[PDB]
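Board work, copied verbatim: COP9 signalosome complex subunit 2
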Amino acid sequence: VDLENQYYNSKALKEDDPKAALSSFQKVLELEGEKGEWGFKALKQMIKINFKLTNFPEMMNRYKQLLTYIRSAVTRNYSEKSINSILDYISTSKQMDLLQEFYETTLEALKDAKNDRLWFKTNTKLGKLYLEREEYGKLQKILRQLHQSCQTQLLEIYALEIQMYTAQKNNKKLKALYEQSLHIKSAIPHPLIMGVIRECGGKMHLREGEFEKAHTDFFEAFKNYDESGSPRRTTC
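↓ predict structure ↓
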């Protein structure tokens, strides 16, 4: 039944040059869409060539065409892996000034209650891009959504909150957040985050006057920064 579409997708996959190949992928899409997993794969390749060579708004258009096979046609797992890989390619190639908008459209299209890690990790990395952008207004909305997703990951949300208030320079809030973050640390995996909050916890203890607790905090933070790497290792 799908014997044709498979072959035309595989035929358009070759060619090397995007000249005439993109129109062939468009012909694969123009076969009446009935499945349509092969149209998704055709557009996925179209995306893979578009941001890598020349024009970007066309990539945004074809990515918006990709964001229709999330719930219907193609399964959530294959779409998750495809979006993740595509986002990694753009992150390695170009910077925030294009990537942030694609992250935003991805989160705008993923309006689904069953999205657990799919919503979270995208919103978290967008939060990091919004930290690099020097935006703190909409970052609070992002952090509101991330905090309300639970009320492992909560410590990440607390680490982003602390990262925001480190630039905002609100000491009392950072003290409250660290004292709240100590509760979640009891049953948790082993990432870098555990040593990030501790750095602030050290500085806070220097602000209050407790130098021994600051010493232990900076020692354990330095151990975590030794396990991950520099630039914060030397400063810690």
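The chain has 13 helices and no strands.
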